[PDB]
Amino acid sequence: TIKEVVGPLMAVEKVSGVKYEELIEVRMQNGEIRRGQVLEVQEDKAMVQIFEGTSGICLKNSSVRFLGHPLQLGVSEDMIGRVFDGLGRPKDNGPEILPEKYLDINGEVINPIARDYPDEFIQTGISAIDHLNTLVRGQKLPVFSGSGLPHKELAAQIARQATVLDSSDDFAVVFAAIGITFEEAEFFMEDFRQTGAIDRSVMFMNLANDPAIERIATPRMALTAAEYLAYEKGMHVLVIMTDMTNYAEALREISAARREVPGRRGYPGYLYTNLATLFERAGRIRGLKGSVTQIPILTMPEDDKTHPIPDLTGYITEGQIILTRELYKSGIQPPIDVLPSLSRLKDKGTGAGKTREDHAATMNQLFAAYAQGKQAKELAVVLGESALSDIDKIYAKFAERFENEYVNQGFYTNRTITETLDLGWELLAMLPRTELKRIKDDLLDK
Amino acid sequence: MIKEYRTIKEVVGPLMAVEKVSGVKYEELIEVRMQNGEIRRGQVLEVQEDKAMVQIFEGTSGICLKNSSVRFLGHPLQLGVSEDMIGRVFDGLGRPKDNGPEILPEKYLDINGEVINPIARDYPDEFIQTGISAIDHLNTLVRGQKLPVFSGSGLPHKELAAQIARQATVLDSSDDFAVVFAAIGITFEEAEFFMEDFRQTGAIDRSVMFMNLANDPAIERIATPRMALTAAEYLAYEKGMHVLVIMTDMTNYAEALREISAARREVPGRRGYPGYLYTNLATLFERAGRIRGLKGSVTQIPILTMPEDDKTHPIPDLTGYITEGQIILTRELYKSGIQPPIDVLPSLSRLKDKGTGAGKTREDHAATMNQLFAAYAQGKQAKELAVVLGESALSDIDKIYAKFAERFENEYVNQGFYTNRTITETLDLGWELLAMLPRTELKRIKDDLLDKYL
Amino acid sequence: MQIGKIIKVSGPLVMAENMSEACIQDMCLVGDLGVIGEIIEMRQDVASIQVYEETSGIGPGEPVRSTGEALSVELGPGIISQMFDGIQRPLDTFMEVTQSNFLGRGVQLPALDHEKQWWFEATIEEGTEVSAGDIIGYVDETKIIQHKIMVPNGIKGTVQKIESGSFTIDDPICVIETEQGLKELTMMQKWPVRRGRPIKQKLNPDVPMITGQRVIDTFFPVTKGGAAAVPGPFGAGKTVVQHQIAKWSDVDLVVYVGCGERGNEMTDVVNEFPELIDPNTGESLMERTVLIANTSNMPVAAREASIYTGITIAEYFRDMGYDVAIMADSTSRWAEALREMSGRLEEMPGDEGYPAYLGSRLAEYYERSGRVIALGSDQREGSITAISAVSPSGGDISEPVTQNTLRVVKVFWGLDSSLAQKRHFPSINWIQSYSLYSTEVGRYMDQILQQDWSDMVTEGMRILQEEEQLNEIVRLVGIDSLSDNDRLTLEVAKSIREDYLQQNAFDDVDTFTSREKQFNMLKVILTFGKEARKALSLGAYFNEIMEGTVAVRERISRSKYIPEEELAKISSINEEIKETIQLI
Numbered sequence A: 001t002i003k004e005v006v007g008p009l010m011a012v013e014k015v016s017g018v019k020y021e022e023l024i025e026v027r028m029q030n031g032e033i034r035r036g037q038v039l040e041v042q043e044d045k046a047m048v049q050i051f052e053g054t055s056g057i058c059l060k061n062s063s064v065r066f067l068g069h070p071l072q073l074g075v076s077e078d079m080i081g082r083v084f085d086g087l088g089r090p091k092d093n094g095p096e097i098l099p100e101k102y103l104d105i106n107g108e109v110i111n112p113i114a115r116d117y118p119d120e121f122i123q124t125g126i127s128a129i130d131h132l133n134t135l136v137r138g139q140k141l142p143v144f145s146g147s148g149l150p151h152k153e154l155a156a157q158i159a160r161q162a163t164v165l166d167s168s169d170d171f172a173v174v175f176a177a178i179g180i181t182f183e184e185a186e187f188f189m190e191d192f193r194q195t196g197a198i199d200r201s202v203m204f205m206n207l208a209n210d211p212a213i214e215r216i217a218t219p220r221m222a223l224t225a226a227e228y229l230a231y232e233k234g235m236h237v238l239v240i241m242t243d244m245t246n247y248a249e250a251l252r253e254i255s256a257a258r259r260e261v262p263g264r265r266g267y268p269g270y271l272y273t274n275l276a277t278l279f280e281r282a283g284r285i286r287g288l289k290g291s292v293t294q295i296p297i298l299t300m301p302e303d304d305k306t307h308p309i310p311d312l313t314g315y316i317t318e319g320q321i322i323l324t325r326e327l328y329k330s331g332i333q334p335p336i337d338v339l340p341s342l343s344r345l346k347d348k349g350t351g352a353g354k355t356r357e358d359h360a361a362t363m364n365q366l367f368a369a370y371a372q373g374k375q376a377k378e379l380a381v382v383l384g385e386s387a388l389s390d391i392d393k394i395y396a397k398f399a400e401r402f403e404n405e406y407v408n409q410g411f412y413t414n415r416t417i418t419e420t421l422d423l424g425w426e427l428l429a430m431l432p433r434t435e436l437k438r439i440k441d442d443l444l445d446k
Numbered sequence B: 001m002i003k004e005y006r007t008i009k010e011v012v013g014p015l016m017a018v019e020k021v022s023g024v025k026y027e028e029l030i031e032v033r034m035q036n037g038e039i040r041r042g043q044v045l046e047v048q049e050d051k052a053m054v055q056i057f058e059g060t061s062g063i064c065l066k067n068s069s070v071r072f073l074g075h076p077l078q079l080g081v082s083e084d085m086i087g088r089v090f091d092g093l094g095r096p097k098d099n100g101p102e103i104l105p106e107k108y109l110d111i112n113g114e115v116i117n118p119i120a121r122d123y124p125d126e127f128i129q130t131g132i133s134a135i136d137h138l139n140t141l142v143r144g145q146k147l148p149v150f151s152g153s154g155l156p157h158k159e160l161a162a163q164i165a166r167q168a169t170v171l172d173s174s175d176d177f178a179v180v181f182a183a184i185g186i187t188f189e190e191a192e193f194f195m196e197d198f199r200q201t202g203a204i205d206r207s208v209m210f211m212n213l214a215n216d217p218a219i220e221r222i223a224t225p226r227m228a229l230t231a232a233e234y235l236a237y238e239k240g241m242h243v244l245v246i247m248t249d250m251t252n253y254a255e256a257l258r259e260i261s262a263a264r265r266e267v268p269g270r271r272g273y274p275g276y277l278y279t280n281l282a283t284l285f286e287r288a289g290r291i292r293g294l295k296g297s298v299t300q301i302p303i304l305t306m307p308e309d310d311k312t313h314p315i316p317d318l319t320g321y322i323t324e325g326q327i328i329l330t331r332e333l334y335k336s337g338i339q340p341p342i343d344v345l346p347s348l349s350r351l352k353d354k355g356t357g358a359g360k361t362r363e364d365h366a367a368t369m370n371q372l373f374a375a376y377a378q379g380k381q382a383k384e385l386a387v388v389l390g391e392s393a394l395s396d397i398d399k400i401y402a403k404f405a406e407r408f409e410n411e412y413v414n415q416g417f418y419t420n421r422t423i424t425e426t427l428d429l430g431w432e433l434l435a436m437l438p439r440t441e442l443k444r445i446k447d448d449l450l451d452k453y454l
Numbered sequence C: 001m002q003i004g005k006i007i008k009v010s011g012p013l014v015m016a017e018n019m020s021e022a023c024i025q026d027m028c029l030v031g032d033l034g035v036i037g038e039i040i041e042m043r044q045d046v047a048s049i050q051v052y053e054e055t056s057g058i059g060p061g062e063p064v065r066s067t068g069e070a071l072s073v074e075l076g077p078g079i080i081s082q083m084f085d086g087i088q089r090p091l092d093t094f095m096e097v098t099q100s101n102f103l104g105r106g107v108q109l110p111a112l113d114h115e116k117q118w119w120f121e122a123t124i125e126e127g128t129e130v131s132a133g134d135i136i137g138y139v140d141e142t143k144i145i146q147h148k149i150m151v152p153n154g155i156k157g158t159v160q161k162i163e164s165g166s167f168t169i170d171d172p173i174c175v176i177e178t179e180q181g182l183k184e185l186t187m188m189q190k191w192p193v194r195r196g197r198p199i200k201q202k203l204n205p206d207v208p209m210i211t212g213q214r215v216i217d218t219f220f221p222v223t224k225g226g227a228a229a230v231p232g233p234f235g236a237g238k239t240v241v242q243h244q245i246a247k248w249s250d251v252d253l254v255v256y257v258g259c260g261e262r263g264n265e266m267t268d269v270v271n272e273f274p275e276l277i278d279p280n281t282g283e284s285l286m287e288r289t290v291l292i293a294n295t296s297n298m299p300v301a302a303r304e305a306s307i308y309t310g311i312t313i314a315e316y317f318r319d320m321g322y323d324v325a326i327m328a329d330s331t332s333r334w335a336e337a338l339r340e341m342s343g344r345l346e347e348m349p350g351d352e353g354y355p356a357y358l359g360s361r362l363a364e365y366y367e368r369s370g371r372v373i374a375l376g377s378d379q380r381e382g383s384i385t386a387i388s389a390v391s392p393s394g395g396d397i398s399e400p401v402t403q404n405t406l407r408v409v410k411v412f413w414g415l416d417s418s419l420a421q422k423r424h425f426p427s428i429n430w431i432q433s434y435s436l437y438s439t440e441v442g443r444y445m446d447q448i449l450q451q452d453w454s455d456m457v458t459e460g461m462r463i464l465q466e467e468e469q470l471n472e473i474v475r476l477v478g479i480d481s482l483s484d485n486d487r488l489t490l491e492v493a494k495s496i497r498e499d500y501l502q503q504n505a506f507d508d509v510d511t512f513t514s515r516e517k518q519f520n521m522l523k524v525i526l527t528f529g530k531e532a533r534k535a536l537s538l539g540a541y542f543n544e545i546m547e548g549t550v551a552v553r554e555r556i557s558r559s560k561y562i563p564e565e566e567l568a569k570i571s572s573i574n575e576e577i578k579e580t581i582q583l584i
Ligand SMILES: Nc1ncnc2c1ncn2[C@@H]1O[C@H](COP(=O)(O)OP(=O)(O)O)[C@@H](O)[C@H]1O
Pocket: B321, B349, B350, B351, C232, C233, C234, C235, C236, C237, C238, C239, C240, C241, C425, C426, C427, C503, C504, C505, C506
């Protein structure tokens, strides 16, 4: 039945009723069984890509059967505490899950008017986030990183320290590793076990040397499990995905297999659609208990904010968390630069009844003072740094203490929202009361 | 034996398509007999089924399709090599240009040649005294090395190359370099410069010329270097002669290589040049060195003009990845009257360490080189500071190094195109320049050498 | 049995019909010359063949015969201290057989010596149940490497007969009583290079490799089983970095692959290495070195074969329990080979013409390195450290090869052309370079040095980072514009670069620096900034500190030359420098 075997691809004749992205099964001449996926289908033939590759396949004495169904996920409540493949296969030497049902990994499209206002506060335990760029339930808050930047530890710290206060009913964390090395993959899987965070999390681990079609199926596999736990089990689900850059690169390979002309910067034209189709599988829904919160993580090529991957993402997600090379070289952990970072829904998760009543003001105070203190340091370098204003001098020492003490908290240090706000006041206590943007009734926190 | 075909299908620029053929091999030499009797040659680029795609060296101008035949000679492009090649001038395809007799060839050798076994290779050890301080001392040339010159349009790379071939000599018994010259798309005046120079020194009597000029076909420029290198390796490994190969212009070779790749509609690399540009140049420049148990050698000094004076351009860039160093000329030094205008900062020799020291040149060779280089780099940085900012901004230690770099260019690098300095004179001149610098700042020279010399 | 028929020859690409019984990734002999080639595509009875030799003089109508086996390597004694080409052919033997100083075509020679007598030493008892990875005996191939004869994969049973003696790699040395019957083993086994050798599991590389390079071992360390890339312009020092590592490493065995580079560089290694001494053992380097050579003028397709031949041999000694370091110089030529073949097959081009599966091919290679648990009941531990060079066009690191590489490697040694034209070697850009092991290695270095070393390195980069930020302001104003605090930071930052980062590889003493020496050398540099910072804080002038500490600098700037066995001289400076300022 097999007509051609070109590299990782395959041409199969006698196709009838074969659908796009339908799974196939190959029985080789020696009895080895491999599976594949339809990338392109015509009346006379169909193009498929084998998961296990095409090396050592005899064209003459091999047979192929079509399964009549695409990639599916065996969903169940027993997924909690389990580590899976990029294809949803058990990766942790545990018992096979008895499925409640089998679902499509493409999911459904949420109605734009079916969404609720982002409401609750998610304590990531990191001061740079919770205070200045607050994560809210249902929000899509991404992390923009670069080659060599410690986004690995940041992903591990968030997935470990993230909690919902005070209501702790059905909170889960779905982690998706996409096309990363084994070291980075093992680091995550080990950290989830040692800390006990595995007991409430679901993992889908995909490696760099896995075929590009598996890398593409990985985010769809994880999000399907998440929306299952969210909508059908009413769980508060937080989803973390890295690296999203690997996902975009995988698309280029498949697009070239179908011989599609590359778009801007070498990526397929439908890159915008694909990212949006993944990321917009989140947010609170009217008439649904559970929800999906996403933290997509990506590395910007050449640290370029104008690159398609971070540029398109910003048009989809409500803000971003920036990691800079400057702060990393300074020893700041995490190296979060608060000036270019943003959370567009932070006010929806702060105030009173959530966090504390002094959240918003100190945030605006710390932000204004850090920016001004950062500027005063520039004047010091060019001027004598000896005749600068007495008030300005404190601002410079404030900006330094803000980066080394406040932002640089560590990758294994968990701060409650109260501890974060209290430390903010001790930093604001360096300046006189005449230089604040907080109200006079904020003399209860000094 | 073989036969001629009157089944030419199409003539498109430098390419010809023949149909209904058999026994045609890849890279096979062909001949094109036109209706007027004129003969043009070419080689097979691609062959499949009953078809064959060839490039025509002389071009397809004036060719009538219906009344022309094509011969397949059953062998790749070869060169009739002999020791009677010495003192003769040939054109781009290895044919007599000096109106002399036809060479009675000892044998015919495929001009692509073969790759030397890395085990059979003998590492270049023997220091070559070119007489040029900027080379002998800082970017040392060794017998069997591929050391090119990176130049530009209007820069005296011709004078520099002529000076080397006129002054290059090892310090041992042999004082005999056989010069194989390959002209590639150069002008008549540039060609006449070497001709007149070789004639006045008498080097013409012990040299072999392969001349492809600017009025000559561009596609011939692809075979010309291989023609010369095959002769070079023949005289060296079969006759035992120490061969010095001069090639110019290398840029014209890449342009011709780009014409064929464009006509064949191949997928371009950076700036339209073929993806195999590196490998193709490598089949030329790797053709050098020594062989164990064999006397004689092949020393290459290729010449290319960097487009837009840009080193990052594919032609000089990939060449630097292939050759064992490069001697770079710049316009800033040429305008300052520096002869030769060698900028040593981007210059390099990858075989200088095991070619100098004690026993070869002098014990202070390596130390003086690194010290002069670093101080020169520091001075040039100080001069730039004196340009953007005032002279007042320069510290006392900045003015000393700035003046060092100035005298380094005037008295050391600038020696003249006809002056032959010995290695001892060069090294002694190096110490007289280091004397301008404080002894405390000589952090690349140990006290042993620092006490012995000034 | 089935003889193919060539229908197309275009460069290293050859197509033939009547190949319906052939298989993908199988080796086949092409044309009358019978040159070695590999099948990469199959369309019915037509196969597309990638040839690892020159295809000149080959045309349609000529026969093509399939071997039925994939591109493999002979694994056994006679592999160390040897130089093979891309497809593992002995180059010294190739010279003897062909009686030529040059490389011919269509000549098939066994990878190893099948006539040389080795002494096999049986170390396992008869009647022992064994499987893949188990040791049955060994051959003392070199003074450094003990070649352990392992049970080949796909073999399981009971050792019936075995004894010591002088055998060749073809002679049966052991009889295994399997399920399919009786099987006899030899000292040599075959293995396909495109398939990674099986293991029990992978581990985390947490043991830092001692390269002897200050800039590497301190700021950008690579662990045993790690993966490092060295991108840079030509003449930046990639080959030297890989050579320094190949001769001063902490590993047991070194595999150097010359991928599409200079032939003389390969000749140079063969000549010098036997004269040098292994850091670990004390014997010659060549006794732990395997050389694979396919030069730039050698067949382009063979560049890819050279890469997979090296990593497979590396995996072989890895399963024995050795720590292997593989050098890829350079991986860019590998990518060029893929681009050439991709164009021949008329595929869809990626960036700069490279295949759209380039990043996947690179991923396959680097994921075959690392610290693993080898197969076998012993559950022994081995590792592979990948040190690759990247050769971007024009020095532009935004090129396809470099960018795809930095997504799978963890260490990035970026070489700067500006440093190379300053005589600043190695030309590693401390600002753009990085290492994902820096934190983990730091804690290891702390425990192994019993000092606050991790805090020193962090402090070290903080100064260099501050210097770059300061140099923007220095660019505009003079030397008498910055504060004494700012001026001190620049003077101690220049010390880090000149006293520590710069390292001459051609200096007998400076070419190597022990882990112990790096500690004491860096401490006296940071002590300078600290004791001077304290001086400035109590009224002392920056200038007064400069002319008052001239002789002290000279001792620190000379500390990189002080003999390993006389390390006290560097440590003593720390007291002296603090007392030199204490004089005033
Ligand atoms: N660590 C080093 N110490 C001393 N010299 C070096 C060092 N690295 C490079 N060099 C010099 O720079 C040149 C470049 O060497 P090489 O590694 O061949 O360049 P490439 O980057 O092209 O491989 C060498 O000839 C050598 O003299």
